[PDB]
mmCIF file of C-alpha atoms and ligand atoms in Angstrom:
data_model
loop_
_atom_site.group_PDB
_atom_site.id
_atom_site.type_symbol
_atom_site.label_atom_id
_atom_site.label_comp_id
_atom_site.label_asym_id
_atom_site.label_seq_id
_atom_site.Cartn_x
_atom_site.Cartn_y
_atom_site.Cartn_z
ATOM 1 C CA UNK B 9 45.594 347.089 -60.236
ATOM 2 C CA UNK B 10 48.452 345.601 -58.543
ATOM 3 C CA UNK B 11 51.864 346.820 -58.001
ATOM 4 C CA UNK B 12 50.496 350.416 -59.617
ATOM 5 C CA UNK B 13 54.227 351.963 -58.711
ATOM 6 C CA UNK B 14 55.550 348.801 -60.568
ATOM 7 C CA UNK B 15 58.026 347.920 -58.442
ATOM 8 C CA UNK B 16 60.585 344.795 -58.996
ATOM 9 C CA UNK B 17 58.382 342.290 -56.532
ATOM 10 C CA UNK B 18 60.679 339.481 -54.959
ATOM 11 C CA UNK B 19 59.288 336.043 -55.108
ATOM 12 C CA UNK B 20 60.241 332.339 -52.267
ATOM 13 C CA UNK B 21 58.305 329.614 -53.269
ATOM 14 C CA UNK B 22 57.966 326.489 -51.451
ATOM 15 C CA UNK B 23 59.001 323.107 -52.884
ATOM 16 C CA UNK B 24 55.663 322.708 -53.241
ATOM 17 C CA UNK B 25 54.638 326.111 -56.010
ATOM 18 C CA UNK B 26 57.621 325.350 -57.786
ATOM 19 C CA UNK B 27 56.150 322.211 -58.793
ATOM 20 C CA UNK B 28 54.223 323.787 -61.556
ATOM 21 C CA UNK B 29 56.191 326.516 -63.837
ATOM 22 C CA UNK B 30 53.683 327.901 -65.560
ATOM 23 C CA UNK B 31 50.880 328.269 -62.850
ATOM 24 C CA UNK B 32 53.959 330.462 -60.564
ATOM 25 C CA UNK B 33 54.516 332.686 -64.001
ATOM 26 C CA UNK B 34 50.437 333.370 -63.246
ATOM 27 C CA UNK B 35 50.723 333.669 -60.066
ATOM 28 C CA UNK B 36 53.339 336.344 -59.979
ATOM 29 C CA UNK B 37 51.519 337.829 -62.207
ATOM 30 C CA UNK B 38 48.927 337.987 -60.489
ATOM 31 C CA UNK B 39 49.874 340.399 -57.448
ATOM 32 C CA UNK B 40 51.159 342.607 -60.482
ATOM 33 C CA UNK B 41 55.139 341.397 -61.028
ATOM 34 C CA UNK B 42 54.900 342.244 -64.986
ATOM 35 C CA UNK B 43 54.205 345.664 -64.423
ATOM 36 C CA UNK B 44 58.288 346.390 -63.290
ATOM 37 C CA UNK B 45 59.327 344.169 -65.890
ATOM 38 C CA UNK B 46 61.520 342.205 -64.181
ATOM 39 C CA UNK B 47 60.725 340.181 -61.404
ATOM 40 C CA UNK B 48 62.954 337.448 -58.783
ATOM 41 C CA UNK B 49 62.422 334.978 -57.753
ATOM 42 C CA UNK B 50 64.506 332.565 -55.111
ATOM 43 C CA UNK B 51 64.607 328.785 -55.202
ATOM 44 C CA UNK B 52 63.406 326.996 -52.610
ATOM 45 C CA UNK B 53 66.532 325.477 -49.750
ATOM 46 C CA UNK B 54 65.816 322.232 -50.768
ATOM 47 C CA UNK B 55 66.121 322.603 -54.843
ATOM 48 C CA UNK B 56 69.451 323.105 -56.393
ATOM 49 C CA UNK B 57 70.441 323.321 -60.367
ATOM 50 C CA UNK B 58 73.488 320.979 -59.800
ATOM 51 C CA UNK B 59 75.259 318.536 -57.488
ATOM 52 C CA UNK B 60 78.916 320.687 -58.230
ATOM 53 C CA UNK B 61 80.301 322.666 -61.169
ATOM 54 C CA UNK B 62 83.993 320.901 -60.579
ATOM 55 C CA UNK B 63 84.499 320.512 -64.300
ATOM 56 C CA UNK B 64 83.386 323.648 -65.821
ATOM 57 C CA UNK B 65 86.470 324.581 -67.399
ATOM 58 C CA UNK B 66 86.658 322.945 -70.128
ATOM 59 C CA UNK B 67 83.327 324.254 -71.988
ATOM 60 C CA UNK B 68 84.894 326.880 -75.247
ATOM 61 C CA UNK B 69 83.885 329.894 -75.735
ATOM 62 C CA UNK B 70 84.486 329.899 -79.160
ATOM 63 C CA UNK B 71 84.017 333.583 -80.694
ATOM 64 C CA UNK B 72 84.924 335.874 -77.010
ATOM 65 C CA UNK B 73 83.455 339.271 -77.755
ATOM 66 C CA UNK B 74 85.889 342.480 -76.595
ATOM 67 C CA UNK B 75 82.926 345.391 -75.430
ATOM 68 C CA UNK B 76 84.700 348.724 -77.048
ATOM 69 C CA UNK B 77 82.585 351.770 -76.238
ATOM 70 C CA UNK B 78 82.193 355.140 -77.639
ATOM 71 C CA UNK B 79 80.113 358.647 -76.482
ATOM 72 C CA UNK B 80 80.319 359.688 -72.482
ATOM 73 C CA UNK B 81 80.225 357.983 -69.494
ATOM 74 C CA UNK B 82 76.161 357.940 -69.041
ATOM 75 C CA UNK B 83 75.515 357.528 -72.936
ATOM 76 C CA UNK B 84 77.429 355.223 -75.032
ATOM 77 C CA UNK B 85 77.227 352.539 -77.614
ATOM 78 C CA UNK B 86 79.177 349.374 -77.450
ATOM 79 C CA UNK B 87 81.251 347.322 -79.983
ATOM 80 C CA UNK B 88 81.960 343.743 -80.341
ATOM 81 C CA UNK B 89 85.197 342.652 -81.662
ATOM 82 C CA UNK B 90 85.570 338.800 -81.903
ATOM 83 C CA UNK B 91 88.367 337.412 -79.908
ATOM 84 C CA UNK B 92 90.481 334.084 -80.621
ATOM 85 C CA UNK B 93 88.577 330.977 -79.030
ATOM 86 C CA UNK B 94 89.948 330.215 -75.160
ATOM 87 C CA UNK B 95 87.860 327.674 -73.086
ATOM 88 C CA UNK B 96 86.638 328.612 -69.545
ATOM 89 C CA UNK B 97 89.381 327.308 -68.058
ATOM 90 C CA UNK B 98 90.997 329.878 -69.711
ATOM 91 C CA UNK B 99 88.442 332.535 -69.181
ATOM 92 C CA UNK B 100 87.890 332.681 -65.482
ATOM 93 C CA UNK B 101 92.273 333.134 -65.404
ATOM 94 C CA UNK B 102 91.949 336.575 -67.456
ATOM 95 C CA UNK B 103 88.881 337.173 -65.690
ATOM 96 C CA UNK B 104 90.625 337.118 -62.243
ATOM 97 C CA UNK B 105 93.758 339.309 -63.816
ATOM 98 C CA UNK B 106 95.163 342.437 -63.142
ATOM 99 C CA UNK B 107 93.951 344.282 -66.300
ATOM 100 C CA UNK B 108 90.331 342.585 -65.809
ATOM 101 C CA UNK B 109 89.523 341.801 -61.789
ATOM 102 C CA UNK B 110 87.133 343.623 -59.872
ATOM 103 C CA UNK B 111 88.696 346.951 -58.073
ATOM 104 C CA UNK B 112 88.539 347.093 -53.940
ATOM 105 C CA UNK B 113 85.024 348.317 -53.157
ATOM 106 C CA UNK B 114 82.926 348.505 -50.611
ATOM 107 C CA UNK B 115 79.337 347.265 -51.072
ATOM 108 C CA UNK B 116 77.089 347.199 -54.633
ATOM 109 C CA UNK B 117 76.510 350.515 -54.581
ATOM 110 C CA UNK B 118 80.040 352.005 -54.153
ATOM 111 C CA UNK B 119 81.028 349.076 -57.218
ATOM 112 C CA UNK B 120 77.621 350.247 -59.020
ATOM 113 C CA UNK B 121 79.427 354.133 -59.111
ATOM 114 C CA UNK B 122 82.945 352.410 -60.387
ATOM 115 C CA UNK B 123 80.982 350.833 -62.888
ATOM 116 C CA UNK B 124 79.202 353.793 -64.403
ATOM 117 C CA UNK B 125 82.128 356.618 -63.486
ATOM 118 C CA UNK B 126 84.814 354.241 -65.241
ATOM 119 C CA UNK B 127 83.149 351.542 -68.015
ATOM 120 C CA UNK B 128 83.563 353.395 -71.031
ATOM 121 C CA UNK B 129 87.849 352.896 -70.363
ATOM 122 C CA UNK B 130 88.213 349.691 -70.504
ATOM 123 C CA UNK B 131 86.299 346.803 -73.032
ATOM 124 C CA UNK B 132 86.219 343.987 -71.420
ATOM 125 C CA UNK B 133 85.810 340.417 -72.750
ATOM 126 C CA UNK B 134 81.864 338.714 -72.507
ATOM 127 C CA UNK B 135 81.280 334.670 -73.896
ATOM 128 C CA UNK B 136 78.254 335.801 -74.985
ATOM 129 C CA UNK B 137 74.876 333.283 -76.626
ATOM 130 C CA UNK B 138 76.882 330.051 -76.186
ATOM 131 C CA UNK B 139 74.217 327.205 -77.232
ATOM 132 C CA UNK B 140 74.141 324.899 -73.924
ATOM 133 C CA UNK B 141 72.283 324.433 -70.265
ATOM 134 C CA UNK B 142 74.312 323.374 -66.998
ATOM 135 C CA UNK B 143 71.036 321.586 -65.144
ATOM 136 C CA UNK B 144 71.773 318.049 -64.044
ATOM 137 C CA UNK B 145 69.342 315.776 -66.302
ATOM 138 C CA UNK B 146 67.646 315.131 -62.781
ATOM 139 C CA UNK B 147 66.546 318.681 -61.920
ATOM 140 C CA UNK B 148 63.393 318.506 -61.742
ATOM 141 C CA UNK B 149 61.677 321.812 -60.889
ATOM 142 C CA UNK B 150 62.627 325.158 -62.774
ATOM 143 C CA UNK B 151 64.867 323.579 -65.579
ATOM 144 C CA UNK B 152 65.382 325.608 -68.163
ATOM 145 C CA UNK B 153 66.211 322.892 -70.772
ATOM 146 C CA UNK B 154 63.047 321.497 -69.336
ATOM 147 C CA UNK B 155 60.118 324.293 -70.386
ATOM 148 C CA UNK B 156 58.155 323.587 -72.921
ATOM 149 C CA UNK B 157 58.162 325.529 -76.150
ATOM 150 C CA UNK B 158 57.487 328.499 -77.749
ATOM 151 C CA UNK B 159 55.820 326.648 -80.621
ATOM 152 C CA UNK B 160 54.423 324.608 -78.170
ATOM 153 C CA UNK B 161 52.332 327.642 -76.682
ATOM 154 C CA UNK B 162 51.872 329.097 -80.278
ATOM 155 C CA UNK B 163 50.225 325.938 -81.484
ATOM 156 C CA UNK B 164 47.569 325.155 -78.322
ATOM 157 C CA UNK B 165 47.155 329.278 -78.506
ATOM 158 C CA UNK B 166 46.438 329.568 -82.528
ATOM 159 C CA UNK B 167 46.383 325.925 -83.801
ATOM 160 C CA UNK B 168 49.345 326.739 -86.305
ATOM 161 C CA UNK B 169 51.943 324.134 -86.630
ATOM 162 C CA UNK B 170 55.700 325.508 -87.283
ATOM 163 C CA UNK B 171 59.230 324.844 -87.406
ATOM 164 C CA UNK B 172 61.384 325.801 -84.946
ATOM 165 C CA UNK B 173 63.397 325.164 -81.922
ATOM 166 C CA UNK B 174 63.888 326.977 -78.119
ATOM 167 C CA UNK B 175 67.386 325.889 -76.460
ATOM 168 C CA UNK B 176 68.920 327.787 -73.133
ATOM 169 C CA UNK B 177 72.382 329.407 -73.422
ATOM 170 C CA UNK B 178 75.292 329.953 -71.819
ATOM 171 C CA UNK B 179 76.968 333.631 -70.560
ATOM 172 C CA UNK B 180 80.382 333.822 -69.198
ATOM 173 C CA UNK B 181 80.971 337.546 -68.162
ATOM 174 C CA UNK B 182 83.884 339.497 -65.603
ATOM 175 C CA UNK B 183 84.192 342.454 -63.992
ATOM 176 C CA UNK B 184 82.052 345.903 -66.302
ATOM 177 C CA UNK B 185 80.664 343.049 -68.813
ATOM 178 C CA UNK B 186 77.696 344.449 -70.225
ATOM 179 C CA UNK B 187 74.149 344.090 -71.633
ATOM 180 C CA UNK B 188 72.710 346.681 -73.234
ATOM 181 C CA UNK B 189 69.302 348.828 -73.526
ATOM 182 C CA UNK B 190 66.560 346.026 -75.399
ATOM 183 C CA UNK B 191 64.157 343.567 -75.091
ATOM 184 C CA UNK B 192 63.508 340.399 -76.050
ATOM 185 C CA UNK B 193 63.689 339.390 -79.473
ATOM 186 C CA UNK B 194 59.183 339.416 -80.894
ATOM 187 C CA UNK B 195 59.341 340.922 -76.811
ATOM 188 C CA UNK B 196 59.279 337.347 -75.643
ATOM 189 C CA UNK B 197 59.629 336.743 -71.743
ATOM 190 C CA UNK B 198 63.004 335.193 -70.744
ATOM 191 C CA UNK B 199 64.376 333.609 -67.411
ATOM 192 C CA UNK B 200 67.874 333.804 -66.487
ATOM 193 C CA UNK B 201 69.197 331.926 -64.108
ATOM 194 C CA UNK B 202 72.651 332.891 -61.934
ATOM 195 C CA UNK B 203 75.154 329.423 -61.573
ATOM 196 C CA UNK B 204 78.104 330.395 -60.373
ATOM 197 C CA UNK B 205 80.178 333.271 -59.329
ATOM 198 C CA UNK B 206 79.825 337.248 -58.828
ATOM 199 C CA UNK B 207 76.591 339.231 -59.140
ATOM 200 C CA UNK B 208 74.779 341.037 -62.184
ATOM 201 C CA UNK B 209 72.681 344.208 -61.354
ATOM 202 C CA UNK B 210 69.906 344.778 -63.308
ATOM 203 C CA UNK B 211 68.288 347.847 -64.879
ATOM 204 C CA UNK B 212 64.365 347.708 -66.097
ATOM 205 C CA UNK B 213 61.213 349.796 -67.661
ATOM 206 C CA UNK B 214 57.943 348.964 -66.848
ATOM 207 C CA UNK B 215 56.220 347.765 -69.983
ATOM 208 C CA UNK B 216 53.924 349.959 -70.076
ATOM 209 C CA UNK B 217 56.703 352.953 -70.738
ATOM 210 C CA UNK B 218 58.915 351.428 -72.430
ATOM 211 C CA UNK B 219 58.507 353.812 -75.623
ATOM 212 C CA UNK B 220 59.071 356.586 -72.863
ATOM 213 C CA UNK B 221 62.719 355.041 -73.031
ATOM 214 C CA UNK B 222 62.946 354.498 -77.034
ATOM 215 C CA UNK B 223 62.049 358.631 -77.359
ATOM 216 C CA UNK B 224 64.553 359.373 -75.723
ATOM 217 C CA UNK B 225 67.061 356.253 -77.721
ATOM 218 C CA UNK B 226 66.190 358.368 -80.482
ATOM 219 C CA UNK B 227 67.439 361.851 -79.240
ATOM 220 C CA UNK B 228 70.842 360.393 -77.838
ATOM 221 C CA UNK B 229 71.499 358.170 -80.739
ATOM 222 C CA UNK B 230 70.006 360.339 -83.476
ATOM 223 C CA UNK B 231 72.534 359.019 -86.509
ATOM 224 C CA UNK B 232 71.688 355.532 -84.818
ATOM 225 C CA UNK B 233 67.744 356.474 -85.325
ATOM 226 C CA UNK B 234 68.059 357.702 -89.051
ATOM 227 C CA UNK B 235 69.374 354.492 -89.451
ATOM 228 C CA UNK B 236 66.319 352.218 -88.430
ATOM 229 C CA UNK B 237 62.887 352.176 -86.896
ATOM 230 C CA UNK B 238 63.467 350.121 -84.154
ATOM 231 C CA UNK B 239 67.555 350.226 -83.419
ATOM 232 C CA UNK B 240 66.987 349.181 -79.894
ATOM 233 C CA UNK B 241 67.163 346.092 -81.611
ATOM 234 C CA UNK B 242 70.682 345.817 -82.382
ATOM 235 C CA UNK B 243 71.156 345.680 -78.981
ATOM 236 C CA UNK B 244 74.512 348.489 -78.159
ATOM 237 C CA UNK B 245 73.120 351.355 -76.392
ATOM 238 C CA UNK B 246 73.881 352.270 -73.206
ATOM 239 C CA UNK B 247 71.840 354.835 -71.092
ATOM 240 C CA UNK B 248 73.213 355.225 -67.035
ATOM 241 C CA UNK B 249 71.046 356.081 -64.419
ATOM 242 C CA UNK B 250 71.714 359.258 -63.780
ATOM 243 C CA UNK B 251 70.394 360.118 -67.134
ATOM 244 C CA UNK B 252 67.768 358.499 -66.674
ATOM 245 C CA UNK B 253 66.573 360.471 -63.975
ATOM 246 C CA UNK B 254 67.575 364.124 -65.781
ATOM 247 C CA UNK B 255 65.115 362.607 -68.533
ATOM 248 C CA UNK B 256 62.252 361.045 -66.430
ATOM 249 C CA UNK B 257 62.509 357.439 -67.596
ATOM 250 C CA UNK B 258 60.791 355.290 -64.770
ATOM 251 C CA UNK B 259 63.230 352.857 -64.485
ATOM 252 C CA UNK B 260 64.146 350.169 -61.802
ATOM 253 C CA UNK B 261 67.812 348.082 -60.388
ATOM 254 C CA UNK B 262 68.329 344.853 -58.911
ATOM 255 C CA UNK B 263 71.303 342.748 -58.076
ATOM 256 C CA UNK B 264 71.126 339.097 -58.519
ATOM 257 C CA UNK B 265 73.388 336.861 -56.658
ATOM 258 C CA UNK B 266 74.368 332.780 -57.037
ATOM 259 C CA UNK B 267 71.511 331.095 -56.804
ATOM 260 C CA UNK B 268 68.733 333.257 -57.853
ATOM 261 C CA UNK B 269 67.215 333.220 -61.232
ATOM 262 C CA UNK B 270 65.451 336.479 -63.122
ATOM 263 C CA UNK B 271 62.478 336.754 -65.398
ATOM 264 C CA UNK B 272 61.740 339.853 -67.925
ATOM 265 C CA UNK B 273 58.272 340.050 -69.874
ATOM 266 C CA UNK B 274 56.905 340.770 -72.031
ATOM 267 C CA UNK B 275 57.949 344.254 -72.883
ATOM 268 C CA UNK B 276 60.512 345.080 -70.507
ATOM 269 C CA UNK B 277 63.556 347.209 -71.197
ATOM 270 C CA UNK B 278 66.446 346.008 -69.156
ATOM 271 C CA UNK B 279 70.150 346.554 -69.342
ATOM 272 C CA UNK B 280 73.374 345.760 -67.226
ATOM 273 C CA UNK B 281 76.719 344.626 -66.065
ATOM 274 C CA UNK B 282 78.461 342.199 -64.111
ATOM 275 C CA UNK B 283 80.207 342.524 -60.828
ATOM 276 C CA UNK B 284 83.339 339.803 -62.139
ATOM 277 C CA UNK B 285 84.268 336.626 -63.166
ATOM 278 C CA UNK B 286 80.063 334.415 -63.987
ATOM 279 C CA UNK B 287 78.657 332.496 -65.838
ATOM 280 C CA UNK B 288 74.544 332.247 -65.891
ATOM 281 C CA UNK B 289 72.062 330.530 -68.092
ATOM 282 C CA UNK B 290 68.608 331.807 -70.141
ATOM 283 C CA UNK B 291 66.013 331.332 -72.274
ATOM 284 C CA UNK B 292 63.227 332.643 -74.256
ATOM 285 C CA UNK B 293 59.850 331.457 -73.642
ATOM 286 C CA UNK B 294 56.327 332.640 -73.744
ATOM 287 C CA UNK B 295 52.878 332.442 -72.585
ATOM 288 C CA UNK B 296 49.241 332.947 -73.515
ATOM 289 C CA UNK B 297 49.327 336.300 -71.917
ATOM 290 C CA UNK B 298 52.806 337.036 -74.183
ATOM 291 C CA UNK B 299 50.597 336.678 -77.641
ATOM 292 C CA UNK B 300 49.312 340.069 -78.303
ATOM 293 C CA UNK B 301 52.605 340.905 -77.371
ATOM 294 C CA UNK B 302 54.991 339.262 -80.399
ATOM 295 C CA UNK B 303 52.105 340.957 -82.620
ATOM 296 C CA UNK B 304 52.796 344.081 -81.432
ATOM 297 C CA UNK B 305 56.353 344.146 -81.936
ATOM 298 C CA UNK B 306 58.754 346.374 -83.363
ATOM 299 C CA UNK B 307 61.298 344.845 -85.786
ATOM 300 C CA UNK B 308 64.735 346.156 -87.151
ATOM 301 C CA UNK B 309 64.388 345.195 -90.706
ATOM 302 C CA UNK B 310 68.055 347.010 -91.859
ATOM 303 C CA UNK B 311 70.144 344.410 -91.504
ATOM 304 C CA UNK B 312 72.173 344.941 -88.291
ATOM 305 C CA UNK B 313 69.503 343.020 -85.648
ATOM 306 C CA UNK B 314 70.087 339.287 -87.501
ATOM 307 C CA UNK B 315 68.639 336.492 -85.302
ATOM 308 C CA UNK B 316 67.873 332.682 -85.054
ATOM 309 C CA UNK B 317 66.181 330.556 -87.456
ATOM 310 C CA UNK B 318 63.587 330.111 -85.342
ATOM 311 C CA UNK B 319 62.050 333.389 -85.150
ATOM 312 C CA UNK B 320 61.253 333.694 -89.372
ATOM 313 C CA UNK B 321 57.724 332.062 -88.167
ATOM 314 C CA UNK B 322 56.797 333.904 -85.592
ATOM 315 C CA UNK B 323 56.741 336.905 -87.609
ATOM 316 C CA UNK B 324 55.437 335.110 -90.411
ATOM 317 C CA UNK B 325 52.234 334.082 -88.258
ATOM 318 C CA UNK B 326 52.040 337.290 -86.162
ATOM 319 C CA UNK B 327 53.273 339.164 -88.399
ATOM 320 C CA UNK B 328 52.324 338.340 -92.338
ATOM 321 C CA UNK B 329 52.656 342.077 -93.348
ATOM 322 C CA UNK B 330 56.187 343.143 -91.972
ATOM 323 C CA UNK B 331 57.169 339.169 -92.799
ATOM 324 C CA UNK B 332 57.797 340.091 -96.491
ATOM 325 C CA UNK B 333 60.176 343.444 -95.041
ATOM 326 C CA UNK B 334 61.419 341.917 -92.674
ATOM 327 C CA UNK B 335 62.479 339.023 -94.645
ATOM 328 C CA UNK B 336 65.290 341.208 -97.059
ATOM 329 C CA UNK B 337 66.573 342.290 -93.597
ATOM 330 C CA UNK B 338 67.469 338.761 -92.841
ATOM 331 C CA UNK B 339 68.457 338.074 -96.241
HETATM 332 O O1 LIG M 412 72.640 337.549 -68.878
HETATM 333 C C1 LIG M 412 73.080 338.758 -70.000
HETATM 334 O O2 LIG M 412 74.010 339.023 -70.611
HETATM 335 C C2 LIG M 412 72.011 338.428 -70.496
HETATM 336 N N1 LIG M 412 70.092 338.256 -70.196
HETATM 337 C C3 LIG M 412 69.347 339.372 -70.515
HETATM 338 O O3 LIG M 412 69.180 340.499 -71.836
HETATM 339 C C4 LIG M 412 68.498 337.664 -70.483
HETATM 340 O O4 LIG M 412 68.716 337.503 -69.769
HETATM 341 O O5 LIG M 412 66.988 338.671 -70.644
HETATM 342 MG MG1 LIG M 413 84.277 320.885 -68.420
HETATM 343 NI NI1 LIG M 414 67.497 340.230 -71.942
HETATM 344 ZN ZN1 LIG M 415 67.776 347.923 -87.941
#
């Protein structure tokens, strides 16, 4: 069995290998990459996402989110307070201001230490889940807005024909902006490209050990666990690496830099934070190996998780027994 320790693998495809997306995912899986839950892909040196970023300040962040924390430094939840709209220009200036800027630090390890120590005492502002793309239409390889759709995957594998569309989202981050422990909707894959700016640190639990994380989360957030049998779907809970190590939860960590892709694999729990002002683009996708994870994915039916239009058909086709209850949660 390849990669039995479930280490995060890093890949360096050639320009030739970068032509066929699906083929390269299948290659990474042949090497055991999926066992980690996350992989890094460094594009060939000849590739570019777009020519320049010179005009990105005119993008609108319609609903910036202030991420307010409650708990202790290593075990906390965050709620999103909606703020008034601002342009990317305005947001970048805010990120770089004395109140919000990255503190002086020696290296990534020191910054990680400062994050876990001090995150809860600040409320950074995140621009999330903004429909759009920053890939040039002429970028033909690994363009996140030109992937084959999840609907077409399910049609090809299973023969059914469903509504729904699948488009990318932009994320604008600053120091301490935080993504909580989660898997993807319907335990899909995700792919994330860091377009510009400062790094993003990721933590991941191997898919084969995801239920270990869920058990700890039930222990650490006991009121939340009574409210919902899949409350990590709410995307609000943080658990530090120190706490994970104390409770024997297997995980790995890696820092993504501008110009690099990360892939999350089905049922790979992940969490992380941004080092300073940055812009990422991400999208969900499917392969034939996903279908069995889609069929088994947990669902939030308490009403909190509320998700896209396109998830309806996935639940309806793959999880018909659950459909009625899940849709009462949506409606
Ligand atoms: O970049 C972020 O804030 C969050 N991204 C993801 O969880 C992802 O790409 O799967
Ligand atoms: Mg612009
Ligand atoms: Ni994700
Ligand atoms: Zn719920």
